[PDB]
Ligand binder design. Structure first.
Ligand SMILES: [Cu+2]
Ligand SMILES: [Cu+2]
Ligand SMILES: [Cu+2]
Ligand SMILES: [Cu+2]
Ligand SMILES: [Cu+2]
Ligand SMILES: [Cu+2]
Ligand SMILES: [Cu+2]
Ligand code: NA
Lengths: 463, 464
């Protein structure tokens, strides 16, 4: 067994636990868990540990830092756990955690310091000195400076539907408005702690994008939701892509002047992009005459020359843009679309991804609801053809890769109530080399990076 | 491919509680998958220190099984170094029945709320698989429960009256231990001991913590009346149970047929095998001790029931063994061997949790130390009563279970709730570690789901 682990190399796997309330680092070279922390011990009464990213450390085994965030409110009530809790904790914390070579230290709550409570993807910036967080119930994203724990920028995104009827509010198109946000409380604090700011009272769960149009999700501004998901970074610098699941759009922002420059449109058969028009000193718009399908997971390739966005449910595919023109995102155009006849139903959804460091392949999860086994698609990232699908387990989420390129490491999470695990796949044979047990509902995972170059294949360039 | 690893382990499911993680989980050791987990805080349990557990026989665990897991609460949250600013920790002391249904866990009931008894230390299944006991060493109460009707069969309180009321001498100089059969005091035949109610001390005497009380490190309203009950372990032959009391270093044998204590075994080397029990009221018994030589903690019978072990701790670190082959008469149980080692002569290691092989030829015993000394597993020849070998594992070693075919010991270590943790598997032929699996857990227990009553002889029933 130690022979088993000695193949993997000295890589540390970090995972949040979703409804377990924990975060944990595992030493893939020995099978030992190095450290873990349980949010509830600190008085977080609803620690839905959601997403995270880790910063470059010259020796992760001596120390490393990471951000992990949580959801809260009625997000406790949507995974089927028959809890009698009446008033769930507000959550939406953004925790800075440092491993000191023995234990995790809860260093700070960045959500409490800044007033932005945001509970979906966390991504590191490519120089490892800042991070972004987005939220799909509030439709806000921000980028943060790690050293000062302060907001660099924050934006609200809003939908104005053509047809105010809920079932048609996205299908018949609408106007997306992007507004740069400014702090409203004393001290330069934002007023978005806890559940404050929500358009809907819980998130749109994996594979659940259409649940809002279907009348399944309560809240006060249902038809104004776009479900922001993530801000992923071009590894070349300068640009980030903000995914918005309901319009199926990735808005490219220029991080130099903090403006949106163009809007990629996910659906197959739809234009490569739509323009972003500025309408006010801090406000921009995108007009869409229709929305063919929602989309979710998004990512750049290691060299930044491709960007992927996974259309889901109304279409299940991998949409690929040629992003090789780093100077001009209005040049980025659809170059390929990975499809398969077996993805013609509502599920599976093409899901989380990770590229090999050499950019030659991308691994993409295939998610279904219970009880179909969920899996990993292996895709040739030179000719954009599906090579292989491999079944893994129920409710498969994210993939990380060891930074030598030799093993993909993924998690599945049992819909928070059935089987869960860590899977390791050998990238030479594309076969599963083992399952390790995992007490986790993880929707995320990362391998602690040593360099900035490692972030190109980490929770920086992709979800 | 680890599947080669896992195919050798066999079809066995390991359950572990997470202590400070607040979870309980089952792992399928044949595939490495976690079958199901549950997080107590999801259910509104704000301080779910998931502590001890026992599982009941199931003809096919993979299609379903049930278990009990209980929790601690109150200031137990504050004793493992976690820099929490929480000021009003949940009261805790829940006892949960959980059922795996082949797909997920189902929190079937809260037996503490149902019965009125909040007891947060060892859980042990009875030999027939139809009942279970739970003991508590801050309240010094234990009870046996009927699983089917989720009711109390019997409950007892145990109290110490010291010869010397000075806290540092309150055990050393002896005292009277009083055992009282309790009656429910609330409507519905409920007891009144939910949450922190009944505590004599405000937290459990932590692993390796026995004397923290005499040295004045532990607050509480009845500090010199504590005996720190630990567990009620069962004779696999039936009839008898042994209730361990850490501070007096005694295991009180009870006759489960009429629920009376019958004899008190005394742990310490050089002291008598046992002391008599005197009945002094319809519901009250006494044991008199002229002194207490050392505390004792882990306790258990061999699978055949003919030996009983009690681990002396801190004043002496040894394994005391009684000949219990006389099933008819516990007053005849007499010390027959003690396992000692030069390396056991400091305060630690403390011989701790244990598991015997199905054939009874060996017993594996945890060696626990405070950080930063590597903790491990001792392998003891259970026929000649000699230490064969010690193996280093990792920090904060806890319990050991064994697969029912006898091939693998499976143990947990728990990082003092802050550092490294994991599940260790040890081949019982070579007595070497055959590897570590990751584990997000602070587990102080673990059990492999049994299929038969015979399996329980090597599970959380005969030993802790
Ligand atoms: Cu996402
Ligand atoms: Cu996911
Ligand atoms: Cu998620
Ligand atoms: Cu114990
Ligand atoms: Cu007999
Ligand atoms: Cu223990
Ligand atoms: Cu414990
Ligand atoms: Na009797």
């Amino acid at each position: 067994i130690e022979e088993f682990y000695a193949q993997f190399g000295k890589y540390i796997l970090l995972v949040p636990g979703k409804f377990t309330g924990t975060v944990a680092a595992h030493d893939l070279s020995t099978g030992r868990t190095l450290a873990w922390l349980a949010g509830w011990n600190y008085g977080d009464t609803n620690p839905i540990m959601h997403h995270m990213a880790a910063f470059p450390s010259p020796d992760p085994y001596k120390g490393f830092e990471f951000i992990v965030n949580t959801q809260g409110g009625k997000n406790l009530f949507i995974y089927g756990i028959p809890t009698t809790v009446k008033e769930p904790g507000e959550g939406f914390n953004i925790y800075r955690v440092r491993y000191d070579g023995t234990k995790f230290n809860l260093v700070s709550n960045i959500a409490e310091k800044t007033g932005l409570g945001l509970g979906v993807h966390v991504t590191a910036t490519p120089d490892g000195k800042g991070f972004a967080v987005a939220d799909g119930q509030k439709d806000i994203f921000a980028e943060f400076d790690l050293a000062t724990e302060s907001v660099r920028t924050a934006f609200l995104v809003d939908w104005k539907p053509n047809n105010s009827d809920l079932k048609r509010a996205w299908l018949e198109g609408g106007t997306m408005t992007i507004t740069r946000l400014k702090p409203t409380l004393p001290g330069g604090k934002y007023d978005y702690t806890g559940t404050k700011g929500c358009k809907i009272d819980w998130e749109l769960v994996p594979g659940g994008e259409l649940f809002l149009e279907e009348g399944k999700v309560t809240g006060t501004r249902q038809t104004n939701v776009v479900a922001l998901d993530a801000f992923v970074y071009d590894p070349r610098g300068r640009w980030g892509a903000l995914s918005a699941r309901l319009p199926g759009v990735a808005i490219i922002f220029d991080r130099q002047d903090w403006e949106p420059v163009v809007a990629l449109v996910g659906a197959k058969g739809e234009p490569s992009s739509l323009p972003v028009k500025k309408v006010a000193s801090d406000t921009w718009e995108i007009k869409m005459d229709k929305v063919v399908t929602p989309a979710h997971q998004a990512g750049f390739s290691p060299d930044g020359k491709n960007f992927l966005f996974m259309n889901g449910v109304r279409q299940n595919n991998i949409m690929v843009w040629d992003t090789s023109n780093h100077a001009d995102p209005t040049k980025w155009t659809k170059k390929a679309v990975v499809e398969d006849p077996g993805w013609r139903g509502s599920y599976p959804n093409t899901f989380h991804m990770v590229f090999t460091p050499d950019g030659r392949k991308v691994y993409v999860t295939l998610w279904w609801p219970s009880p179909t086994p969920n899996g990993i698609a292996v895709v040739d990232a030179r000719n954009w053809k599906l090579l292989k699908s491999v079944d893994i387990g129920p409710d498969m989420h994210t993939l990380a890769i060891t930074y030598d390129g030799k093993y993909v490491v993924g998690v599945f999470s049992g819909y928070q109530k059935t089987a869960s695990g860590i899977v390791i796949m050998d990238t030479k044979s594309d076969e599963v080399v083992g399952i390790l047990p995992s007490v986790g509902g993880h929707h995320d995972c990362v391998i602690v990076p040593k360099t900035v170059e490692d972030l190109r294949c980490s929770r920086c360039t992709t979800t």
